Enzyme design. Structure first.
Site, PDB file in Angstrom:
ATOM      1  CB  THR A 106     -14.957  41.832 -32.949  1.00 52.32           C
ATOM      2  OG1 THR A 106     -16.298  41.338 -33.040  1.00 52.32           O
ATOM      3  CG2 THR A 106     -14.938  42.994 -31.986  1.00 52.32           C
ATOM      4  CB  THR A 107     -10.271  41.646 -32.151  1.00 50.00           C
ATOM      5  OG1 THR A 107     -11.122  41.771 -31.006  1.00 50.00           O
ATOM      6  CG2 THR A 107      -8.896  42.157 -31.804  1.00 50.00           C
ATOM      7  CG  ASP A 134     -12.164  38.874 -34.284  1.00 50.78           C
ATOM      8  OD1 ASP A 134     -12.165  39.761 -35.164  1.00 50.78           O
ATOM      9  OD2 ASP A 134     -12.779  39.003 -33.204  1.00 50.78           O
ATOM     10  CB  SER A 169     -14.428  46.599 -36.573  1.00 56.08           C
ATOM     11  OG  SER A 169     -13.425  45.596 -36.574  1.00 56.08           O
TER      12      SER A 169
END
Lengths: 191, 238, 239, 226, 240, 152
Positions: free
Chosen positions: A1-2, A17, A46
């Site tokens: 995600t991040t 991540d 993402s």
């Protein structure tokens, strides 16, 4: 995600991540979220997964074919333009949060960002992912222009640490990537 | 001579003779003369008939509000390039909402006539265009060829026996640049009265004049605003 | 014979076709010589240049075309067929890399190029690309490879390889030279390549005319040598 | 060219392709009681060539062998076509394709190339075999689209001489080993004097499946087999 | 003399006579040379008026393909116009797909493949053109290329296309080409073109000079030749 | 080159007179590359002629004075490498060899009479190379006749 990318004077530093989730269940706990395309240029993704994977494979195809035909190492802005075209052409069907970074012999380290729409811009640092809003909260507080490599590593370490700590979808483990004139340096941290 | 049948074949001297034959097909049209001043461009052609009673086959035809062409040679290709010309005019007149500059239109004409001169299956266009127009920089007198090697001039003349016309244009091209419409038009027909054999004279019904001006829209004339143009002459020096 | 004037690609009586065996000397209008050698864990290309002009450059006369990062080649014959064949090779290697996820072995690439030349041969109304291509590359579990691709679409590949103008003589020297069972310790390969071209052409010339392309199982990247180390090998074989 | 018949005879461009087949490298193939033996004759021009790169004996499925006598560059094309076609049959029916159906469809392809009028025919004669439903088979094709069924046959240089030896030497009842023995005999009748572990290249077809023999057992067997 | 009709067929000795006949078509065309300096590329074309019917400023063989690339064509003019349009289209695709200026090697290779593709088949003829391609870049320097009618495309310092192909490069190569900036090379090309064919077969000719390099900051345009007027006051000093 | 060999010759005229034949080692690549350049007809052949005549003087001082048969093999290896970088198809540049070996076999004439026959016959087996591989010449091989007469 991040996902996160910060450049400095010598080169760039990436980070993400892993923790690819679907709904409320974690399908996969550890993921190569950042992807090599050429030996000096990365992209981190993402949004949806299949979209970014297929786009990254076709970009790898076109960029490898083009850079072999030039018989010269490719540019970063070239790969950013390729991602721009493929993102923009199927915005009706794709969900890409592609962030391009990589060192270049002519132009040094560069960071490009392509959000869900399909625009392309050059920045000195970038965020990305649903749990990126928070470190986007303080990335204009802690950042200092003209860092070293270790300052960028510690910076993104604290960043992705707090992003994984706060967001429910974010988490997992910290992956880093350091791209410079010298080499490609990947490592797996926790803390 | 057994290599001298098609467009595709290069000659062993490199001169593709289908182009030469199309040039010679252009050489058998009617005589016509186009010449410009600094402010007005005038092209004058010559009519002919099939018999005495019939009317005369026309040459000056309209294209657009500031574009008019003369013609020599075939008429099917003439009307084909006419329809393509009007089409490309109203295309840019629709899109850009401006009148066309002449040079890009004639470049499109060359690019149009390029394809039937290189692939197999179409003939080169037997065509005798003399184009008068107005861009921002004044009148232009262009000519074409079946080899699509379009020329810009200040005064040309194509058709049958048009070389005496060219000699007249040589000995008055310095004089052309200063004058207004009336003596300009009578220089044009003082080329046409030498495009004819000397035992007959240019009458009303066989001549045609088309003027385009920097403020004047392109207009064709026939016998009635040409009866003013035909007086103001003397006889030939017999 | 003909008779039939061999204008298109048909079968003549007894029994051959003449278009491809006219294409086999479209190489011979190149005026050029190429030699490839495989002895051991290395592989060496050598090919001279014919530059009479001082106004002409020297970098862009290169015939060694780096196909991919582990596959090199050299071309002879006419230049346009050669360069178009090279871009087809690069495109199809990139197609391999896209479709199958890993680096192409040099065998499948020669097969694909041969098949393209056969399709250009099978269907008429196209010229059969009169150039010859020699490839080199390193493969795991097979060592190095040297292959040859024909304008006809007949690939083969073998130890000591030569094509161009004067290579009946080159293969005569390579039969008279690859018959003794010594190993080929990479300077043996470079020395035998330089001296085989130096006995076929019999020139014994500057280091600035030949081009040397090597690949080795220590650095599997394709590598083109520099004037200094070419001069080093040339005086290293100078006794 | 290919669009019009002769005044009385046949299709001269197919006859010339058959002549180009007959001018090719020799081969022999024998159908025995339990298996089928194929054998070719593969001479390198120089001492430089490698014998591990190009392969004459080539499998179509795990139990179907196939050799030729003609041109490899067309051979590989129609091989690839037969590959894709056999895998399409196995997609449709989920069962390994029988050899008669292979020969029908391959003959349809070759016939479609013999149709008018810009492509040349293949200069390739096949020898197709396989062990479908116990009884093994052997099917020869040709550039003209036709096909046959043999007990033992040959194709290439001196196929007439090898066939007259096959008529004398071979019979109805043998095993695979005796078939290989008479096959290397009739190939050794016509080949050059130096026949080694690499000049020949032999694949067999047991009922347990196709098997392409190695130079180890080929050199063990033809080490003066008689 | 036996088989030279189609562009697909070979000869009994192995070459295509269509390509040779198209190559010597440009030999009758006007003389066009080019040369580069250490900070630019200079073009120059001997252009002739027919008799008195031209306008001195029509049908200029010095085209302008990209912002920094132009042609110096010689041969059949309309074929060169179409090829220039194809080159404009190729530079258009590259600018649209990659966001920066086309390298001249890649442009020349695409154009060479296009010309080769018109030499391949039997339906079409080979081109009757031979043209020059110059460039300049801040990270690449000056590059001057050359495309024959067949499609063989490689690089030069100087070249000549026309009748006097040898007779220009006889005294082109005695120029100290490296140590000169192009502002000397302007009158150098003027004297080279002015040497060949003053009055012998024809009556009169006229000079055009194109111009690209560092002094134009990467632009390509025709010189203001009337500015510094470098031909005639030296052409009249080049007859002795 | 023309001046390229003129420099070497015009310089080394005393570099070996009393100075040791080490400037020879300092001039071996000189003469080597002078021959390598190899002017078509006569110029660099004249230069190499001056060079090989200075080398004949060096033979008088080393191979005819010290008679080591190792300095003889050294001069022969010098000319050997020189011919390794030189075609000598009788290509108008062979005076580096023809009269060089002529004076070499005249040295031999002075050697078999003066030097022990073993070093001079080593020089002779090297002259075997010099001509039998170096385009055997009539009078040079008449000297071969008299030298095999010397072997007799």
């Amino acid at each position: 995600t991040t996902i996160m990318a910060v450049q400095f004077d010598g080169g760039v530093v990436l980070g993400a991540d892993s923790r690819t989730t679907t709904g409320s269940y974690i399908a996969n706990r550890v993921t190569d979220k950042l992807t090599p395309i050429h030996d000096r240029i990365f992209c981190c993704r993402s949004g949806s997964a299949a979209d970014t994977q297929a786009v990254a494979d076709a970009v790898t195809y076109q960029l490898g074919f083009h850079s072999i035909e030039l018989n010269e190492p490719p540019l970063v802005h070239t790969a950013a333009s390729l991602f721009k075209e493929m993102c923009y052409r199927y915005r009706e069907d794709l969900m890409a949060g592609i962030i391009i970074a990589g060192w270049d012999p002519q132009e040094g380290g560069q960071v490009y960002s392509v959000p869900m729409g399909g625009m392309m811009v050059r920045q000195s640092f970038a965020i990305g992912g649903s749990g990126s809003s928070y470190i986007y909260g303080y990335v204009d507080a802690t950042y200092r222009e003209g860092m070293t490599k270790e300052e960028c590593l510690q910076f993104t370490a604290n960043a992705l640490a707090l992003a994984m700590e706060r967001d429910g979808s974010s988490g997992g483990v910290i992956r880093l990537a350091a791209i410079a004139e010298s080499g490609v340096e990947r490592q797996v941290l926790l803390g | 001579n057994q290599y001298d049948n098609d467009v595709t074949v290069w000659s062993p001297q490199g001169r593709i003779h289908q182009i030469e034959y199309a040039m010679e097909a252009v050489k058998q049209g009617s005589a016509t003369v186009g010449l410009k001043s600094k402010t007005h461009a005038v092209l004058v052609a010559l009519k002919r008939a099939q018999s005495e009673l019939a009317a005369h086959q026309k040459k000056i035809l309209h294209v657009d509000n500031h574009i008019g062409i003369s013609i020599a040679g075939l008429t099917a290709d003439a009307r084909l390039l006419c329809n393509f010309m009007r089409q490309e005019c109203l295309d840019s007149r629709f899109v850009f909402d401006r009148p066309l500059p002449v040079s890009r239109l004639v470049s499109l004409i060359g690019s149009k006539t390029q394809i039937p001169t290189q692939r197999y299956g179409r003939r080169p266009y037997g065509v005798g265009l003399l184009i008068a127009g107005y861009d921002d920089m004044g009148p232009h007198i262009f000519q074409t060829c079946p080899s699509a090697n379009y020329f810009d001039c200040r005064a040309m003349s194509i058709g049958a026996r048009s070389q005496s016309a060219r000699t007249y244009l040589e000995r008055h091209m310095s004089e052309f640049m200063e004058c207004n419409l009336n003596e300009l038009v009578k220089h044009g027909l003082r080329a046409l009265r030498e495009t004819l054999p000397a035992e007959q004279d240019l009458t009303t019904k066989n001549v045609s004049i088309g003027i385009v001006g920097k403020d004047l829209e392109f207009t064709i004339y026939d016998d009635d605003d040409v009866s003013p143009f035909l007086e103001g002459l003397e006889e030939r020096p017999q | 014979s003909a008779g039939f004037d061999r204008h298109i690609t048909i079968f003549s009586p007894e029994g051959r076709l003449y278009q491809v065996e006219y294409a086999f000397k479209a190489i011979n209008q190149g005026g050029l010589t190429s030699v490839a050698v495989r002895g051991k864990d290395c592989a060496v290309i050598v090919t001279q240049k014919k530059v009479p002009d001082k106004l002409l450059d020297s970098s862009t006369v290169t015939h060694l075309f780096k196909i991919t990062e582990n596959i090199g080649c050299v071309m002879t014959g006419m230049t346009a067929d050669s360069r178009s064949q090279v871009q087809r090779a690069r495109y199809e290697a990139a197609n391999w890399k896209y479709k199958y996820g890993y680096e192409i072995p040099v065998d499948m690439l020669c097969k694909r190029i041969a098949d393209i030349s056969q399709v250009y041969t099978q269907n008429a109304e196209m010229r059969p690309l009169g150039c010859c291509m020699i490839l080199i590359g390193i493969d795991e579990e097979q060592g190095p490879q040297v292959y040859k691709c024909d304008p006809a679409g007949y690939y083969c590949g073998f130890k000591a390889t030569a094509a161009g103008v004067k290579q009946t003589e080159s293969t005569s020297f390579l039969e008279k030279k690859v018959k003794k069972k010594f190993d080929w310790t990479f300077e043996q390969t470079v020395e035998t390549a330089i001296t085989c071209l130096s006995t076929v052409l019999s020139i014994d010339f500057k280091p600035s005319e030949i081009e040397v392309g090597v690949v080795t199982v220590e650095n599997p990247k394709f590598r083109i040598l520099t004037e200094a180390e070419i001069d080093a090998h040339l005086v290293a074989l100078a006794e | 060219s290919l669009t019009t018949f002769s005044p009385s005879g046949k299709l001269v461009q197919i006859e010339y392709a058959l002549a180009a087949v007959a001018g090719g490298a020799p081969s022999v193939g024998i159908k025995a009681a339990n298996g089928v033996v194929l054998a070719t004759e593969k001479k390198q021009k120089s001492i430089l060539y490698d014998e591990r790169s190009v392969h004459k004996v080539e499998p179509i499925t795990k139990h179907i062998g196939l050799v030729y006598s003609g041109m490899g560059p067309d051979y590989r094309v129609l091989v690839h076509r037969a590959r894709k076609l056999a895998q399409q049959y196995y997609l449709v029916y989920q069962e390994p394709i029988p050899t008669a159906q292979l020969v029908q469809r391959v003959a349809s392809v070759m016939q479609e190339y013999t149709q008018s009028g810009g492509v040349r025919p293949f200069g390739v004669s096949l020898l197709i075999c396989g062990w479908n439903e116990g009884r093994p088979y052997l099917f020869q094709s040709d550039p003209s689209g036709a096909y046959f069924a043999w007990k033992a046959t040959a194709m290439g240089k001196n196929y007439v001489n090898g066939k007259t030896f096959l008529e004398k030497r071979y019979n109805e009842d043998l095993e695979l080993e005796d078939a290989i023995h008479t096959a290397i005999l009739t190939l050794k009748e016509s080949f050059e004097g130096q026949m080694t572990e690499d000049n020949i290249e032999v694949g067999i077809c047991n009922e347990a499946g196709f098997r392409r023999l190695t130079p180890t057992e080929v050199k063990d067997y033809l080490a003066a087999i008689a | 003399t036996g088989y030279d009709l189609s562009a697909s067929t070979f000869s009994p000795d192995g070459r295509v006579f269509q390509v040779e006949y198209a190559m010597k078509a440009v030999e009758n065309s006007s003389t066009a040379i080019g040369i580069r300096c250490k900070d630019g590329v200079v073009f120059g074309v001997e252009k002739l008026v027919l008799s008195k019917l031209y306008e001195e400023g029509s049908n200029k063989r010095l085209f302008n393909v990209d912002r920094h690339v132009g042609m110096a064509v010689a041969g059949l003019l309309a074929d060169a116009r179409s090829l220039a349009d194809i080159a404009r289209e190729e530079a258009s695709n590259f600018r649209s797909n990659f966001g920066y200026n086309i390298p001249l090697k890649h442009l020349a290779d695409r154009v060479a493949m296009y010309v080769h593709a018109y030499t391949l088949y039997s339906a079409v003829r080979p081109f009757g053109c031979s043209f020059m391609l110059g460039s300049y870049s801040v990270n690449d320097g000056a590059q001057l290329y050359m495309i024959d009618p067949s499609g063989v495309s490689y690089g030069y310092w100087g070249c000549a296309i026309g009748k006097a192909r040898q007779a220009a490069k006889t005294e082109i190569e005695k120029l100290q080409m490296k140590e000169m900036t192009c502002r000397d090379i302007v009158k150098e090309v003027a004297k080279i073109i002015y040497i060949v064919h003053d009055e012998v077969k024809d009556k009169a000719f006229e000079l055009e000079l194109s111009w690209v390099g560092e002094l134009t900051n990467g632009r390509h345009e025709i010189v203001p030749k009337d500015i510094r007027e470098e031909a005639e006051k030296y052409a009249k000093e080049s007859l002795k | 080159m023309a001046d390229g060999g003129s420099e070497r010759a015009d310089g080394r005229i005393v570099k070996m007179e009393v100075d040791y034949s080490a400037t020879v080692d300092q001039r071996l690549p000189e003469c080597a590359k002078l021959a390598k350049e190899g002017r078509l007809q006569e110029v660099i052949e004249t230069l190499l002629s001056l060079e090989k005549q200075t080398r004949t003087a060096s033979d008088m001082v080393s191979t005819s004075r010290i008679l080591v048969a190792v300095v003889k093999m050294c001069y022969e290896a010098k000319e050997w490498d020189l011919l390794n970088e030189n075609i000598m198809l009788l290509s108008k540049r062979r005076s580096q060899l023809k009269q060089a070996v002529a004076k070499m076999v005249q040295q031999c004439c002075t050697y078999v009479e003066e030097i022990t026959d073993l070093p001079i016959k080593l020089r002779l087996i090297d002259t075997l190379r010099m001509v039998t591989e170096g385009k055997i010449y009539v009078e040079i091989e008449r000297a071969r006749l008299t030298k095999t007469l010397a072997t007799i």
